[PDB]
Design an enzyme around this catalytic site. Structure first.
Site, short mmCIF file in Angstrom:
data_model
loop_
_atom_site.label_atom_id
_atom_site.label_comp_id
_atom_site.label_asym_id
_atom_site.label_seq_id
_atom_site.Cartn_x
_atom_site.Cartn_y
_atom_site.Cartn_z
CG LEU A 16 -2.07 -1.10 1.26
CD1 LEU A 16 -2.75 -1.09 2.62
CD2 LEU A 16 -3.11 -1.00 0.13
CD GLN A 18 9.09 0.60 0.17
OE1 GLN A 18 9.85 0.43 1.12
NE2 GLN A 18 9.50 0.52 -1.09
N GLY A 22 9.41 1.19 7.04
CA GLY A 22 9.19 -0.08 6.36
C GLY A 22 8.03 0.02 5.39
CE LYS A 38 -0.07 2.28 11.14
NZ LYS A 38 -0.94 2.46 9.94
CG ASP A 129 2.62 14.54 11.19
OD1 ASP A 129 2.52 15.66 10.59
OD2 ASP A 129 3.20 13.54 10.68
#
Length: 266
Positions: A16, A18, A22, A38, A129
């Site tokens: 999905l 990068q 990872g 994840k 964030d």
């Protein structure tokens, strides 16, 4: 702890996204439930600090936050979550379904993020964030807050979303989160455009310090932009709460703009 699971219970399938942590995969868990995972790459990020994201996800449970499911704390390392079928809000907003979003669906999506953040707010956490790229979309236009990589209990950073005092002095609070929510409101109203168009980071920092704020996006009602301006008040502290934002957004079309008529884009 009791969140831990064995590897075998899972299975990864589609890839999905990068990053320098990872990978991110879609999958199934206990071969019956649809999940998201994840991954880490051969210890490219500090193992103890990587699971500090899930550490935080453990203590947060809300309908408008992406729900942790399980963890594989033993290398190779993973983090398993509920699956959000429509991917990221930023992709959604500027993709093919994005162009038919109008104000009422976008206000409804803001309401849900605010509702998710109001929970963060009363739990005494900070996101750090908050932005379109960190919201996931599910079916039925459901929106949930995600990417708690940096979330802290209240005890570099892309200045375009980050409140001045937090970018400068590392003063992150729920009120710096409010500031980002104001910028998130511009991404929603512009179908996902980068804020401060044509302005570069240091240009943004210098201008914001001098009191420059983004103007009303085209067709955005003034009352929504006023809300934006409140979120971007110089003093972290004169900014409204999430609880207020939630309530004002959920009620928007009756209490604030009962005269709204659909336009060309909003």
């Amino acid at each position: 702890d009791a969140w831990e699971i064995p590897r075998e219970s899972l299975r990864l399938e589609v890839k999905l996204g990068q990053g320098c942590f990872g990978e991110v995969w879609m999958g199934t868990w206990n071969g019956t439930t649809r999940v998201a995972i994840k991954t880490l790459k051969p210890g490219t990020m500090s193992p103890e600090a990587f699971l500090q994201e899930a550490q935080v996800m453990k203590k947060l449970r809300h309908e408008k936050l992406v729900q942790l499911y399980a963890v594989v704390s033993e290398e190779p390392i993973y983090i398993v979550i509920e699956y959000m079928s429509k991917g990221s809000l930023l992709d959604f907003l500027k993709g093919e379904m994005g162009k038919y979003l109008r104000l009422p669906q976008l206000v409804d999506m803001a309401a849900q993020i605010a509702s998710g953040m109001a929970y963060v707010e009363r739990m005494n956490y900070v996101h750090r964030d908050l932005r379109a790229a960190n919201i996931l979309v599910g079916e039925n236009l459901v929106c949930k807050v995600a990417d708690f990589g940096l979330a802290r209990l209240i005890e570099k950073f892309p200045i375009k979303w980050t409140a001045p005092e937090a970018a400068l002095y590392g003063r992150f609070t729920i009120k710096s989160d409010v500031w980002s929510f104001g910028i998130l409101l511009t991404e929603l109203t512009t179908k996902g455009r980068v804020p401060y168009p044509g302005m570069v980071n240091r240009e943004v920092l210098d201008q914001v310090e001098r009191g420059y704020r983004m103007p009303c996006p085209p067709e955005c009602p003034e009352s929504l932009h006023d809300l934006m301006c409140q979120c971007w008040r110089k003093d972290p502290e004169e900014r409204p709460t999430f609880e207020y934002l939630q309530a004002f957004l959920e009620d928007y079309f009756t209490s604030t703009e009962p005269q709204y008529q659909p336009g060309e884009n909003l």
